[PDB]
Write an enzyme that holds these catalytic residues in place. Structure first.
Site, short mmCIF file in Angstrom:
data_model
loop_
_atom_site.label_atom_id
_atom_site.label_comp_id
_atom_site.label_asym_id
_atom_site.label_seq_id
_atom_site.Cartn_x
_atom_site.Cartn_y
_atom_site.Cartn_z
N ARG A 45 14.15 -4.30 6.48
CA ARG A 45 12.71 -4.12 6.44
C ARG A 45 12.09 -5.50 6.62
O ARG A 45 12.60 -6.49 6.09
CB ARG A 45 12.34 -3.54 5.07
N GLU A 135 1.89 -0.30 0.57
CA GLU A 135 1.36 0.12 -0.73
C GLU A 135 -0.15 0.35 -0.67
O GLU A 135 -0.91 -0.29 -1.40
CB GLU A 135 1.69 -0.91 -1.81
N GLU A 245 11.18 -0.18 -1.73
CA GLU A 245 11.14 -1.44 -2.47
C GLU A 245 11.67 -1.21 -3.87
O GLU A 245 11.24 -0.28 -4.54
CB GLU A 245 9.71 -1.98 -2.59
#
Ligand SMILES: *[C@@H]1O[C@H](CO)[C@@H](O)[C@H](O)[C@H]1NC(C)=O
Length: 332
Positions: A45, A135, A245
């Site tokens: 990522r 997010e 995450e």
């Protein structure tokens, strides 16, 4: 079981430029991407920022490391922050130069995404996953896309998604929407419900729902709460799900928050990381269409606490050597 076994290695070039020399568990020097691959990782990522002043994490920075990942047989997950700096629930700063009015901002977001996608394609990089925002639980591109302007948020996300769909990327990547606090079903449900009811962004516009899952920002982040939340997300929207995450400390002297009850027995050590990561991985695999797990910045040794109250969440020694916990990706 998991389709994606990865880590966010964004800081790799920053660390190498800072003098870090990565080594395998045997203690021998080896390129980080090769160490990761050797340990079971199949996807990396990377955070992408629009126009950071120092250039770190900008598109060129990402194309360079994406090429290295590709050469190591690793797939790439592009995480668009749609900001010149860190994007999180409390910060969704407008990229410098971008317009604030919804009509033009939506168009800019589309152009930027389409442009970035085509540049990646031209560089021979076809990411397997692309998140439109990082997010974005409190929205994105503030204040225009700040919650609760669901209408603007849905519109912006629609433009971003189609920027990818109209691009030359071939094969096309899976489009992901990423929210924090994966264990918080109430918030996940509240967010997706209000965004989807606008009628612009449709369920068919994206493919994955990603969530962040950390144990040190609230004792409510239990494994059981994560399980229940992901199960609910799966039954409601039936999209592929992934924890994009996560961290587990090898050292946490004075935490800001009490740890979740079902993880208090896990020690702060490499062995403990192995246990935690494996357990989170299996929670995801027990969920309908749960397909991925990504550890956040395991090799950022010069930023060991990784922005948390715990002292060290990395999976590498301070000398740059991969810890025994890195091989966990070979067993999930
Ligand atoms: C988006 O790109 C098109 C085509 O290049 C251009 O005409 C338009 O002005 C751009 N929109 C914005 C707001 O940048």
């Amino acid at each position: 079981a998991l389709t994606y076994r990865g880590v966010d290695w964004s800081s790799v070039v920053v660390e190498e430029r800072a003098g870090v020399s990565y080594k395998n568990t045997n203690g021998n020097a080896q390129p980080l991407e090769n160490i990761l691959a050797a340990n079971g990782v199949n996807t990396v990522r990377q955070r992408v920022w629009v126009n950071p002043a120092d250039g770190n994490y900008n598109l060129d920075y990402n194309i360079a490391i994406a090429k290295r990942a590709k050469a190591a047989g690793l797939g790439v997950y592009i995480d668009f922050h749609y900001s010149d700096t860190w994007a999180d629930p409390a910060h969704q700063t407008m990229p410098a130069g971008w317009p604030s009015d919804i009509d033009n901002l939506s168009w800019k977001l589309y152009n930027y995404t389409l442009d970035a996608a085509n540049k990646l394609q031209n560089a021979g990089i076809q990411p397997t996953i692309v998140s439109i925002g990082n997010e974005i639980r409190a929205g994105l591109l503030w204040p225009t896309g700040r919650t609760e302007n669901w209408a603007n948020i849905a519109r912006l996300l629609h433009s971003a998604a189609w920027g990818i769909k109209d691009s030359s990327l071939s094969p096309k990547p899976k489009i992901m929407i990423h929210l924090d606090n994966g264990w918080d079903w109430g918030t996940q449900n509240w967010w997706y419900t209000n965004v989807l009811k606008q009628g612009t962004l449709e369920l068919s516009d994206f493919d994955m729902m990603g969530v962040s899952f950390y144990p040190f920002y609230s004792s409510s982040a239990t494994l059981s709460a994560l399980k229940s939340s992901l199960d609910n997300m799966a039954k409601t929207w039936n999209k592929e799900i992934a924890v994009v995450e996560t961290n587990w400390p090898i050292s946490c002297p004075n935490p800001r928050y009490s740890f979740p009850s079902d993880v208090k027995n896990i020690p702060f050590s490499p062995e403990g990381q192995t246990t935690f990561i494996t357990n989170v991985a299996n929670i995801v695999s027990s969920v309908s269409r749960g397909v991925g797990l990504f550890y956040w910045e395991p090799a950022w040794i010069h930023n060991a606490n990784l922005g948390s109250s715990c002292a060290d969440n990395t999976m590498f020694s301070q000398s740059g050597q991969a810890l025994s916990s890195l091989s966990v990706f070979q067993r999930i």
